Every structure is written in structure tokens, then in C-alpha cells.
């Protein structure tokens, strides 16, 4: 019985961009969420359709692990039902979601003297993402009349922004990692239990 | 914050690699990507570096851009003469919602050692007094590489109005020339005990002084 | 090639208009910005607007919004800058070139990749005048720089010599320095020894001739 390789998501070196969120497909292995769940570390621990501490007696077929790094009051919105920048687009949990949402603070390791501009989202949007719904596109955004012709002016806006993480910011504008966990129950072996 | 500063100056003996840093903002370098732009004297400027360092068709391998954060920099590694010029960082800014250039550095190839500046400086003579005008002039000669700066003096307090610099030229001997001009009125040449001329050469200091007698 | 061709130098006086012009060539004219680019005599790159000509929308520095005008006319594949009255203070060099657009890793590219050959413009109010002449005597604190201050000419040049043409070594005519009235002043200064300043006399030639100006002045110690 193979443990989980939960470390290469939690303990990555590098996230990624909310936008270009990371998925990670975690099957075969068998391990334990109380210490996740009992670890001092993580500031956000909300697991929906399912509980956290009884997660040891459950098994499931597969799971999603998807990582990004948002800004600290914007983890609310990862969650089903929220709208808002990151909810409508960047990274949208579906209603009916079933799993947990981890996060933690990573100022130590996000922010740089001077900001640390690596970690950007989505501002702008024709529309809201659908749950799950990837877009790493880098158009510029009409949001007037004026056509943009790949430059930025009249109403014409670069769809990314910087987070510009910098050590001072307060915790609300600090950096933290965020680990999705998506339960997933098809009509297969459960393989996949605490 | 919507500036790109550069050093004014830099230098290198053939075969030398020297490095030019472009300082930026949230505003510019941090949402958008930095480029380069090399100008020979008396030529257009040309495309050096694209998207920090991409380089286009004919420009070789010796020239690396980078960026980090608000920061950026040009690497030339082993310097050949052809790339004496001055260099212009650039980006985008979404303050200004435009491009802007960075205050550009000249890159000399030192073909011959260090020179300093050679300093003559001469008070208003008599028969332009009589004509109810005062101008002293400041010779700045056999300086090499080709960049100063000059600071005017009254007494010892700072002068600026009135000041007419021109920008260094290549003399005979590849060193370079410039002179300096301060007009007054006979008035405030005959008030103060002496003005001074100052130029600056890679970190020395040149002064001369005049005074009305 | 991809190549960019802008109008001959101009000289021009405060208060005239001016249109010059930049015809592009070896690519699709209306799928690409076109700049224009200011370089005041010694100083630096500023940016001062772009067009495309394809729909001939425009977007300006805000240092130049309302100072001047770009236009395009794609039917002949031109770029135009233009000022309604000039002032001295438009001398420069004016480059256009082409822009480039996109992004890279999450960030805005923007750049000028094919660039004109410039065109320089001139605009003064200056009238033909000659110079006064005044002597640069020695000072009287092993060698000894005199000379004579050119003043106040336009326009250039002017020539220099000394003892007509006898004395050559150790002469340095320096470049001149265009003043803000519009006129041009220069010095010239020949270096001897301290010990000839009384036995060998010294008289700067100077000639301006758009204002056939000739003056010979002898420098002498300063009493
Ligand atoms: C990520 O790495 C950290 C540190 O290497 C692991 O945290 C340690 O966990 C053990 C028990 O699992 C504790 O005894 C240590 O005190 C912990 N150290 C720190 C610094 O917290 C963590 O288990 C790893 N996580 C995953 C999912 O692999
Ligand atoms: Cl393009």
C-alpha cells in the first residue's frame, strides 16, 4: 500500500498562478488527513459533502489535487456559490462540490522585498468561468467601444495583474497557497482511503 | 514612479563584459516585460533586446537582457569596438498608458587609458565689461572617455541660471572636448570675490577660479 | 525587408506648420502600429504617440496629446507627425518606427522592431549676424593658455586662425555652444609657453561668412 504523494502538492517549491491553476490526479494510495486536518499550519481547512476528522473511513475512486496562490481575503471565495474576481475568473468550485479547501499563509516564501510580481490573476472576463474552466489567454480586454489592436488605452486592458506580493502588505494582500481537494465517487473501485 | 533609470555612463577594455541595470515600478517592469534599444553616434536606434531577452536576426550572442521584478540589466560580454553606443532600456507603463524609454547609458570601448579633463577657465575680459556684459568660459579638454559634468560656482555657493554647456565631442587625438559658458552682468561678477568651475570626470573633480581684479 | 522611409531634413521658423512623413514598405501596412520618436540634440529617446493605420485609431504620450498630430493614409502606406506652429523648441530628430504587440508568460510585450532613418527639424528665429570678438588674456599666475571668445554669430560657422595661419601648433578651436537667444558663441585658445607671452605678439583671425565679418583681435596680458 503506497502512501499518498501528497508532498510533491503541498511541499511543491513553486505554485502556480490561480489563473493557470495546477491539477494534480491523486488514485492508488492510502493516506491519513488527521494530521493534515491536526496540523498547526493550515489557517483554512472547509471540506464540503464530506467531514474532515471521519475523512480516515472513507474511500473514494479518485482525487484532484489543484494548487494556486491567491492573496489571503480572496480564500473565501474559494468555495461553491462565491462570485468575485477569482471565483468568476480564475479558478470556480462547482455547487454541488464535494471535497476540501486548504490554505495557509506563505508570506516566507511568496513575498520578496520589492514584490514578487510571478504570481498574477484574471481581472477581466467576457464571461464567468465554468466550474473548473482553465484560461491562460492574454488578449486584450475591450472592455469599450474602441477597438484595442493589441494595445492598452481607451478602455483596452491587460487581462493579468500582478500580485506584486511584498512582506509589508497586510495578511488581507499576503500571499497563501491553496490546496483543492476534489472526492471524486464514479462506479469504480474505491482506491483511495484514509 | 513611471521612470526607468539607467546609469549615465559605462566602460570596458575589448573582450570585457559590462553590465547596464534598468530600475523600474510596479507600474512599468512589474506587469510588463522590458527591451533595449542600441544606437550607434550619428545612427538610428535599433531593436537590441525583445520580452527582457529575446534577441532579433542580427543580433549576436554576446548581448543577454534580464529582468527580475522592478529590475532589469544588459549583459555585453567580450566587448568589441562596434559596440560602443549608447543603450536605451524600455516598457511599457500603465500609469502614462504608454511606452516609456529609459534615460539611456553610454558604453564606451576604451581604446586607450583613462584620461582626465584638461580645465581652462577665463573671466570676463575688460572690453566686454565696457560693453556692459560678463561671460567666463570654461575649457574642458583631453578627457577620456567622453563624458563630464560641470557645476558653476559663486564664492561657494551654487550657480545654475545663466549656464550654456555643449555636449562633449571627439577631439583630434580620440579624447574629447566640451567648454561651458556663464553670463552675468557685470554687476554680479564684480559683487562676488570669485566664481569657480567645477568638472567632474569619473569620480574626480576639477576646479578652477577666477576672480575680478 | 520590412523598412521604414521618412521626409528630408527641415528648416523651418517658429510659427510655420509642419508635416513629415514616414511610407512604410515589405509588409501589411494596416496590421501593425506605427510611433513616432523624439530626440532633442544630445539627450535622450521620448515617445510620443502611435497610430494604426488600419482603422487610424491613435494613442499619444501625454506629454504630446494635443501638441501634435499623427495621421496615417494607407492607400499609399505613410505615417504622418504634424505641427500646426512650431516652436524653437521642436528642434530635434524625429524617428518613426514600427510596433510589435503581445505577451509572454502572463506579460505585455511591447516594442519598436523596424525603425526610419530620422529626420531632423530646425526651427529658429535667428538672423544672419556676426560675431563680437574678445580677447581671453593669459593669466598672470611653465606654459600659459590665451585665446579669443566668439560671441553671439549666427549662423554657423565661423574659422578661427592665429597670426594668419603662422600658428598652428597647440591651437584648439572648441565646438560652439547654441545659446537659448538662437545665436552661437565659441572660443578659441592656443596654449604657449609662459616665457614668449612678452616678446611674441598673438592676434586670433576670425571669419564669419554669411555676414562677411572679419576681425583680427590682439590678445594681450591683462594690465
Ligand atoms: C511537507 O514537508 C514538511 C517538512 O518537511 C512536513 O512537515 C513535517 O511533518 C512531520 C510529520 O509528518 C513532523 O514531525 C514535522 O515536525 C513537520 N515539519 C514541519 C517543518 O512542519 C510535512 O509532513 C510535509 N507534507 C507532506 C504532505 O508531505
Ligand atoms: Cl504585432
Known sequence: ????????????????????????????????????????????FKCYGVSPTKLNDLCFTNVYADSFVIRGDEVRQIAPGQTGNIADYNYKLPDDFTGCVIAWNSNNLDSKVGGN?????????????????????????????????????????????????????????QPYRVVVLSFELLHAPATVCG | QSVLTQPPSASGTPGQRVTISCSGSSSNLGGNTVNWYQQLPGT????????????????????????????????????????????????????????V????????????????????????????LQANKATLVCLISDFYPGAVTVAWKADSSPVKAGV??????????????????????????????????????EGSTVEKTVAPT | EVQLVQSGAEVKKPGESLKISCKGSGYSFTN????????????????????????????????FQGQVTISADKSIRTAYLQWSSLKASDSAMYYCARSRVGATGGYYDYYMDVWGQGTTVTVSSASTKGPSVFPLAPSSKGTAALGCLVKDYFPE??????????????????????????????????????????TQTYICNVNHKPSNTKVDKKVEPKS
Not at chain 1, 511541499?11 to 492508488?28: E, G, H, L
Not at chain 1, 484574471?122 to 494595445?151: H, M, W
Open chain 3, 32 to 63: 501593425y502600429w506605427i510611433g513616432w520618436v523624439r530626440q532633442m540634440p544630445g539627450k535622450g529617446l521620448e515617445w510620443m504617440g502611435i497610430i494604426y493605420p488600419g482603422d487610424s485609431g491613435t494613442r499619444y504620450s501625454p506629454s
Open chain 1, 117 to 173: 510580481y510571478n504570481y498574477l490573476y484574471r481581472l477581466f472576463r467576457k464571461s464567468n468561468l465554468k466550474p473548473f474552466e482553465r484560461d491562460i489567454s492574454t488578449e486584450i480586454y475591450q472592455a469599450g467601444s474602441t477597438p484595442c489592436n493589441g494595445v492598452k488605452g481607451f478602455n483596452c486592458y491587460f487581462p493579468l495583474q500582478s500580485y506584486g506580493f511584498q512582506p509589508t502588505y497586510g495578511v488581507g494582500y
Open chain 1, 1 to 44: 500500500t503506497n502512501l499518498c504523494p501528497f508532498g510533491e502538492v503541498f511541499n511543491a517549491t513553486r505554485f502556480a498562478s490561480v489563473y493557470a491553476w495546477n491539477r494534480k490526479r491523486i488514485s492508488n494510495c492510502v493516506a491519513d488527513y488527521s494530521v493534515l486536518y491536526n496540523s498547526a499550519s493550515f489557517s483554512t
Open chain 3, 157 to 198: 560657422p565661423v574659422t578661427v586662425s592665429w597670426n594668419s595661419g603662422a600658428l598652428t601648433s597647440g591651437v584648439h578651436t572648441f565646438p560652439a555652444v547654441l545659446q537659448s537667444s538662437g545665436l552661437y558663441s565659441l572660443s578659441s585658445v592656443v596654449t604657449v609657453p609662459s616665457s614668449s607671452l612678452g
Open chain 2, 164 to 201: 550654456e554647456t555643449t555636449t562633449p565631442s571627439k577631439q583630434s587625438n580620440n579624447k574629447y572636448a566640451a567648454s561651458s559658458y556663464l553670463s552675468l552682468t557685470p554687476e554680479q561678477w564684480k559683487s562676488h570675490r570669485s566664481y569657480s568651475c567645477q568638472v567632474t570626470h
Open chain 2, 44 to 99: 538610428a536606434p535599433k531593436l537590441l533586446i525583445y520580452s527582457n531577452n529575446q534577441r532579433p536576426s542580427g543580433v549576436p550572442d554576446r548581448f543577454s537582457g534580464s529582468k527580475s521584478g522592478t529590475s532589469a540589466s544588459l549583459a555585453i560580454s567580450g566587448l568589441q569596438s562596434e559596440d560602443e553606443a549608447d543603450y536605451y532600456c524600455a516598457a511599457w507603463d500603465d500609469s502614462l498608458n504608454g511606452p
Open chain 2, 101 to 128: 524609454f529609459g534615460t539611456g547609458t553610454k558604453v564606451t570601448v576604451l581604446g586607450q587609458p583613462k584620461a582626465n579633463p584638461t580645465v581652462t577657465l577665463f573671466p570676463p575680459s575688460s572690453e566686454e
